[PDB]
C-alpha cells in the first residue's frame, strides 16, 4: 500500500498513485481484466441457468446469450435454440480463466515488483519514451488484429455464423464470399451518419461484416508492425502530450465514441444484432404494427392501397419522400427500415402491393406480430409498454438495455476524456496544482482584454 | 412538423407572440434523414418541411 503525503493523492484518487509504478499498474489491469472475464463468465452462466426454452431469448433479459447465438452456437433455423451447452462452455471457460487473470492481477499488485524497469527491461516503460509506447501499442494491435481474424475464421471455416438474411430463413451460414472490396468496405466509413445512411450501423449483410473484419484484421497486424518498427514523427511530437494520463485520455475519447456507436448499433442494426435473438429494433416494431393491421384489414375486406387515412395521406400505404411505397401512419419516419421478414414483400419501387395483396406468407405475419408486442419500450422496473400501461407483462428489450447502458457509459467516458485530457495537458504544462501566485500570467497581460 | 400535411405556425409574422412563437422541428416524413438546403428543390420546400430547424440544431 501507500499513503497520501508520500504521493500527494488522497484515498479517493489513489489509483493515480500507481502511475509511475509499472508493476503495480500491471497488476491493476490484469486483475481488472479478470473482472471483465469474471463478469462474462458469471453473467453467462446466470443467463444459461435462467434460460427457459419456451420463451424467446429477448424476452428473458438475456444480453450475453444473443452474442453467442449470433456466432451460431446452439441455434437452429429461424432462431430456434437447439441446445444450451455451447453457451455453458463459454461461461465456464471465462469463469475459470478469470481465476488465472485474477491470480496474476493479485500477484503483481501485492508480491510482484513495484516498477518493472530495472529487472525486466522488456516490459519496463517510461511514459515519455515514445518508442516503447508505440512498441506496446503495436503488440496489442496484433492482438486485436488476430482477434479480428477469429471472427473471420469462425465465419469462414469454424461452422459459420448466424445470417438472419439467409435464403430459407435465418440460420447459421458459412460466409464463403466475404466482401474484400475497398470501395464497399471503406464506403461505410465515409457514409453520412444520418437517415438512409446510418454511417456503419446499416451494414446490411454478414458478407460485409466478415469482409470488413478481414480489413480490420490485416490493418491492425500491419499497423502493429508499423508501430513496433517506428517512433512517432516530429509532427506527432508537436501535437500530443506524452504522459500516462494523456495516453489514458486518448483512449477515453476513442472508447467513448465506441460506446455511442454500439449504442446506435444495437438500436438500429438487425444483421450483426439479429432480431430473433435481440428482439425487434425501434424501427422494426413500429413497421411491424403497420404490417400487422394491413394484414388484419385485408382479411376483413378492405383495399389497403385505396384506404385513405384521416389526414388524407393513406392509412396503410403511403409514398416515401423519395418516392417509395412505404407503410403509412407515424411510422413514415422508419420507412428506410429493412427487415428479413419484410424485404421478401419489397420490390424496386418500394413495397410491391401486388406481392403484398396475394403473397403475404403465414410465417411473416407470425414474426411481425411477435415484434409488435415486443417493442423496445418498457419501464425501469421492466413493465413493458408505453408509460400509460398496466403491470401485465415483464419485458424490456435487450436493445433497450444495450443502448441505454452504452449511451451512459459512452457519455461518462467522454466526460472522462474531458477530465483527463484537460488535466494531462495542464499537468504537463505545470499548472495543474494552481496559479503560481508569484507569476500569475493574467497579471502580465494587457487589461481591457 | 407532424408529416401529415398540416402546417404549424411558429413565426411572429404568422400570428405569434414571444411565448407561442417557435422554430418548428423538422417534418416527420424526413425523420432522421439529412435535409440541407441543397437537397430541396426550392427554398420554400425547405421551409415547408422543417428545414430551418435541422440547420439550427446541427450548427
Amino acid at each position: 500500500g501507500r499513503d497520501q503525503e508520500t504521493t500527494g493523492f488522497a484515498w479517493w484518487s489513489g489509483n493515480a498513485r500507481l502511475i509511475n509504478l509499472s508493476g503495480k499498474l500491471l497488476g491493476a489491469h490484469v486483475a481488472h481484466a479478470g473482472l471483465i472475464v469474471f463478469w462474462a463468465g458469471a453473467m453467462n452462466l446466470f443467463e444459461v441457468s435462467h434460460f427457459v426454452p419456451e420463451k424467446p431469448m429477448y424476452e428473458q433479459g438475456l444480453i450475453l446469450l444473443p452474442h453467442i447465438a449470433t456466432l451460431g452456437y446452439g441455434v437452429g433455423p429461424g432462431g430456434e435454440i437447439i441446445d444450451t451447452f455451447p453457451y455453458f462452455v463459454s461461461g465456464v471457460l471465462h469463469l475459470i480463466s478469470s481465476a488465472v487473470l485474477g491470480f496474476g492481477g493479485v500477484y503483481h499488485s501485492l508480491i510482484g515488483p513495484e516498477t518493472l524497469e530495472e529487472s525486466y527491461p522488456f516490459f519496463g516503460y517510461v511514459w515519455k519514451d515514445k518508442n516503447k509506447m508505440t512498441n506496446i501499442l503495436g503488440y496489442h494491435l496484433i492482438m486485436l488484429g488476430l482477434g479480428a481474424w477469429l471472427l473471420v475464421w469462425k465465419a469462414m471455416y469454424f461452422g459459420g455464423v448466424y445470417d438472419t438474411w439467409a435464403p430459407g430463413g435465418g440460420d447459421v451460414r458459412v460466409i464463403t464470399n466475404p466482401t474484400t472490396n475497398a470501395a464497399v468496405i471503406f464506403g461505410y466509413l465515409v457514409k453520412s451518419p444520418f437517415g438512409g445512411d446510418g454511417w456503419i450501423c446499416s451494414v446490411d449483410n454478414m458478407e460485409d461484416i466478415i469482409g470488413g473484419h478481414i480489413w480490420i484484421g490485416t490493418l491492425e497486424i500491419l499497423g502493429g508492425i508499423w508501430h513496433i518498427y517506428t517512433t512517432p514523427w516530429p509532427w506527432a511530437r508537436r501535437a500530443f502530450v506524452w504522459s500516462g494520463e494523456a495516453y489514458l485520455s486518448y483512449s477515453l475519447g476513442a472508447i467513448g465514441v465506441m460506446g455511442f456507436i454500439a449504442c446506435c448499433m444495437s438500436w438500429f442494426n438487425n444483421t450483426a444484432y439479429p432480431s430473433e435473438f435481440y428482439g425487434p429494433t425501434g424501427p422494426e416494431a413500429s413497421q411491424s404494427q403497420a404490417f400487422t393491421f394491413l394484414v388484419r384489414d385485408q382479411r376483413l375486406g378492405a383495399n389497403v392501397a385505396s384506404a385513405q387515412g384521416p389526414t388524407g395521406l393513406g392509412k396503410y400505404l403511403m409514398r416515401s419522400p423519395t418516392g417509395e411505397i412505404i407503410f403509412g401512419g407515424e411510422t413514415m419516419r422508419f420507412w428506410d427500415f429493412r427487415g428479413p421478414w419484410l424485404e421478401p414483400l419489397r420490390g424496386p419501387n418500394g413495397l410491391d402491393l401486388n406481392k403484398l395483396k396475394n403473397d403475404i406468407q403465414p410465417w411473416q405475419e407470425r414474426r411481425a406480430a411477435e415484434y409488435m408486442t415486443h417493442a423496445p419500450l418498457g419501464s425501469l422496473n421492466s413493465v413493458g409498454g408505453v408509460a400509460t400501461e398496466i403491470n401485465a407483462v415483464n419485458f424490456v428489450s435487450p436493445r433497450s438495455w444495450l443502448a441505454c447502458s452504452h449511451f451512459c457509459l459512452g457519455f461518462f467516458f467522454f466526460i472522462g476524456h474531458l477530465w483527463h485530457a484537460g488535466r494531462a495537458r495542464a499537468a504537463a504544462a505545470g499548472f495543474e496544482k494552481g496559479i503560481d501566485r508569484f507569476d500569475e500570467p493574467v497579471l502580465s497581460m494587457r487589461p481591457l482584454d | 412538423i407532424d408529416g401529415i400535411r398540416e402546417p404549424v405556425s411558429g413565426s411572429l409574422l404568422y400570428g405569434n407572440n414571444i411565448i407561442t412563437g417557435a422554430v418548428i422541428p423538422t417534418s416527420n416524413a424526413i425523420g432522421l434523414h439529412f435535409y440541407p438546403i441543397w437537397e430541396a428543390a426550392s427554398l420554400d420546400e425547405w421551409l415547408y418541411n422543417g428545414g430551418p430547424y435541422q440547420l439550427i440544431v446541427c450548427h
Binding site: 487589461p447 481591457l448 | 411572429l12 409574422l13 405569434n16 407572440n17 414571444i18 412563437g21
Partner: peptide, 30 residues
Amino acid sequence: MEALVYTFLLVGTLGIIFFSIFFRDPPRMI
C-alpha cells in the same frame, strides 16, 4: 403591428447585450 413591437423588444435586448460586452465598465486592478 404587435410583431413590430415584439422584434423591437428582441432587438433592444440584443442591443444591451452588445453594449454590455463591448462597452462594459472596465475592471480596474490594484
